[PDB]
Enzyme design. Sequence first.
Site, PDB file in Angstrom:
ATOM      1  N   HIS A 273     -32.024   8.394   1.727  1.00 21.32           N
ATOM      2  CA  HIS A 273     -33.178   9.346   1.709  1.00 21.32           C
ATOM      3  C   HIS A 273     -34.441   8.524   1.319  1.00 21.32           C
ATOM      4  O   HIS A 273     -34.339   7.537   0.613  1.00 21.32           O
ATOM      5  CB  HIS A 273     -32.916  10.463   0.716  1.00 21.32           C
ATOM      6  CG  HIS A 273     -31.540  11.017   0.851  1.00 21.32           C
ATOM      7  ND1 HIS A 273     -31.068  11.525   2.055  1.00 21.32           N
ATOM      8  CD2 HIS A 273     -30.531  11.070  -0.038  1.00 21.32           C
ATOM      9  CE1 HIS A 273     -29.804  11.913   1.850  1.00 21.32           C
ATOM     10  NE2 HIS A 273     -29.460  11.678   0.603  1.00 21.32           N
TER      11      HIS A 273
ATOM     12  N   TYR B 220     -31.813  10.837   6.731  1.00 21.03           N
ATOM     13  CA  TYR B 220     -31.769  12.268   6.851  1.00 21.03           C
ATOM     14  C   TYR B 220     -32.179  12.822   5.456  1.00 21.03           C
ATOM     15  O   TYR B 220     -32.264  12.106   4.507  1.00 21.03           O
ATOM     16  CB  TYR B 220     -30.411  12.787   7.343  1.00 21.03           C
ATOM     17  CG  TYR B 220     -29.201  12.399   6.502  1.00 21.03           C
ATOM     18  CD1 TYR B 220     -28.780  13.219   5.450  1.00 21.03           C
ATOM     19  CD2 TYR B 220     -28.492  11.230   6.761  1.00 21.03           C
ATOM     20  CE1 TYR B 220     -27.685  12.858   4.706  1.00 21.03           C
ATOM     21  CE2 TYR B 220     -27.365  10.933   6.057  1.00 21.03           C
ATOM     22  CZ  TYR B 220     -26.983  11.720   5.023  1.00 21.03           C
ATOM     23  OH  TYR B 220     -25.850  11.381   4.270  1.00 21.03           O
TER      24      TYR B 220
HETATM   25  C1  LIG Z   1     -24.960   5.336  -0.722  1.00 21.78           C
HETATM   26  C2  LIG Z   1     -24.787   5.720   0.755  1.00 21.78           C
HETATM   27  O1  LIG Z   1     -25.193   5.059   1.717  1.00 21.78           O
HETATM   28  N1  LIG Z   1     -23.921   6.735   0.931  1.00 21.78           N
HETATM   29  C3  LIG Z   1     -23.591   7.226   2.277  1.00 21.78           C
HETATM   30  C4  LIG Z   1     -22.318   6.465   2.777  1.00 21.78           C
HETATM   31  O2  LIG Z   1     -21.334   6.726   1.780  1.00 21.78           O
HETATM   32  C5  LIG Z   1     -20.120   6.000   1.723  1.00 21.78           C
HETATM   33  C6  LIG Z   1     -19.617   5.445   2.874  1.00 21.78           C
HETATM   34  C7  LIG Z   1     -18.353   4.752   2.736  1.00 21.78           C
HETATM   35  C8  LIG Z   1     -17.799   4.734   1.491  1.00 21.78           C
HETATM   36  C9  LIG Z   1     -18.278   5.260   0.328  1.00 21.78           C
HETATM   37  C10 LIG Z   1     -19.503   5.967   0.481  1.00 21.78           C
HETATM   38  N2  LIG Z   1     -20.044   6.495  -0.627  1.00 21.78           N
HETATM   39  O3  LIG Z   1     -19.318   6.994  -1.738  1.00 21.78           O
HETATM   40  O4  LIG Z   1     -21.382   6.129  -0.935  1.00 21.78           O
HETATM   41  O5  LIG Z   1     -21.999   6.993   4.058  1.00 21.78           O
HETATM   42  C11 LIG Z   1     -21.643   8.421   4.101  1.00 21.78           C
HETATM   43  C12 LIG Z   1     -21.331   8.748   5.537  1.00 21.78           C
HETATM   44  O6  LIG Z   1     -20.007   8.128   5.802  1.00 21.78           O
HETATM   45  C13 LIG Z   1     -22.855   9.222   3.586  1.00 21.78           C
HETATM   46  O7  LIG Z   1     -23.925   9.171   4.536  1.00 21.78           O
HETATM   47  C14 LIG Z   1     -23.353   8.749   2.232  1.00 21.78           C
HETATM   48  O8  LIG Z   1     -24.605   9.309   1.875  1.00 21.78           O
HETATM   49  C15 LIG Z   1     -24.495  10.457   1.057  1.00 21.78           C
HETATM   50  O9  LIG Z   1     -24.245  11.530   1.962  1.00 21.78           O
HETATM   51  C16 LIG Z   1     -24.193  12.838   1.248  1.00 21.78           C
HETATM   52  C17 LIG Z   1     -23.736  13.880   2.228  1.00 21.78           C
HETATM   53  O10 LIG Z   1     -22.364  13.558   2.640  1.00 21.78           O
HETATM   54  C18 LIG Z   1     -25.576  13.107   0.683  1.00 21.78           C
HETATM   55  O11 LIG Z   1     -26.548  13.100   1.782  1.00 21.78           O
HETATM   56  C19 LIG Z   1     -25.920  11.970  -0.318  1.00 21.78           C
HETATM   57  O12 LIG Z   1     -27.252  12.170  -0.863  1.00 21.78           O
HETATM   58  C20 LIG Z   1     -25.832  10.662   0.440  1.00 21.78           C
HETATM   59  O13 LIG Z   1     -26.008   9.555  -0.522  1.00 21.78           O
END
Ligand SMILES: CC(=O)N[C@H]1[C@@H](Oc2ccccc2[N+](=O)O)O[C@H](CO)[C@H](O)[C@@H]1O[C@@H]1O[C@H](CO)[C@H](O)[C@H](O)[C@H]1O
Length: 272
Positions: free
Chosen positions: A248, A209
């Site tokens: 991304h 996304y």
């Molecule tokens: C690095 C990645 O895949 N991040 C995802 C992931 O995040 C986590 C899941 C479980 C535990 C810790 C994390 N985290 O601190 O990385 O999955 C979540 C959904 O559960 C999100 O998709 C993370 O991605 C982030 O999402 C935010 C919006 O919430 C934003 O798009 C960031 O750019 C994105 O990295």
Amino acid sequence: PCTCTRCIEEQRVSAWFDERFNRSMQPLLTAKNAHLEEDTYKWWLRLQREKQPNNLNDTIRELFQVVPGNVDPLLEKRLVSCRRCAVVGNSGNLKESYYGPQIDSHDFVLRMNKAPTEGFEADVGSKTTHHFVYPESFRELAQEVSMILVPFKTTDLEWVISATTTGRISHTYVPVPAKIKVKKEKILIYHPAFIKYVFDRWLQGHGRYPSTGILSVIFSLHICDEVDLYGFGADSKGNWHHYWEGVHDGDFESNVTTILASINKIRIFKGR
Ligand SMILES: CC(=O)N[C@H]1[C@@H](Oc2ccccc2[N+](=O)O)O[C@H](CO)[C@H](O)[C@@H]1O[C@@H]1O[C@H](CO)[C@H](O)[C@H](O)[C@H]1O
């Protein structure tokens, strides 16, 4: 027609742009526009895959008992003839750029994530009109700043309700602030359907996304007549770090901004 040197909306400048830009899109959620099509709702639920989310329509009704439910979706662009905006990303290419005064000269200045201005004003400016956040990437905002929540799951909307009232949500996939100080009247909600428009039409399906940076850029193409980007991309040494300190497709998103600049629909200030 806008009264700026060029106008982002103008058609028949670039057919690449016209294929992608859809002037009918509404970038902010309102009670009027909150009905999602089933395909859009299912796609949006699949971004973060919460188990057994609450009914979205109930969640949005409760949300608009708290924050404003009848914002103009283009933030009253209809009342101005040339709205100039600065979108400020987080790149360390802003360090020693001295871009602050030129950033602050714009009508709107849009910032994102936990990026600070205090102690960085000569490089990044002191003005903020709008600041994009999500529960996992929030910092307290000055009281004049509109907060644009970008919701990636149902709980992000419930977090706005909680964090301005009961303070019951303190964890999503990571810890999130139980309370924020932002006034409820200053809160805006990025429309889920506009997230999917960015993904399908601007990113052509690349990445899981869109990044917050590219969501901010395409939002600004709709709300502004003239857009300048600061703090996007690497620095001149090829480093990716923030100026103050696999989800991304950053290369595909980068290339969208490069193409936009090449057709004069934005300007990019590369920094240092
Ligand atoms: C690095 C990645 O895949 N991040 C995802 C992931 O995040 C986590 C899941 C479980 C535990 C810790 C994390 N985290 O601190 O990385 O999955 C979540 C959904 O559960 C999100 O998709 C993370 O991605 C982030 O999402 C935010 C919006 O919430 C934003 O798009 C960031 O750019 C994105 O990295």
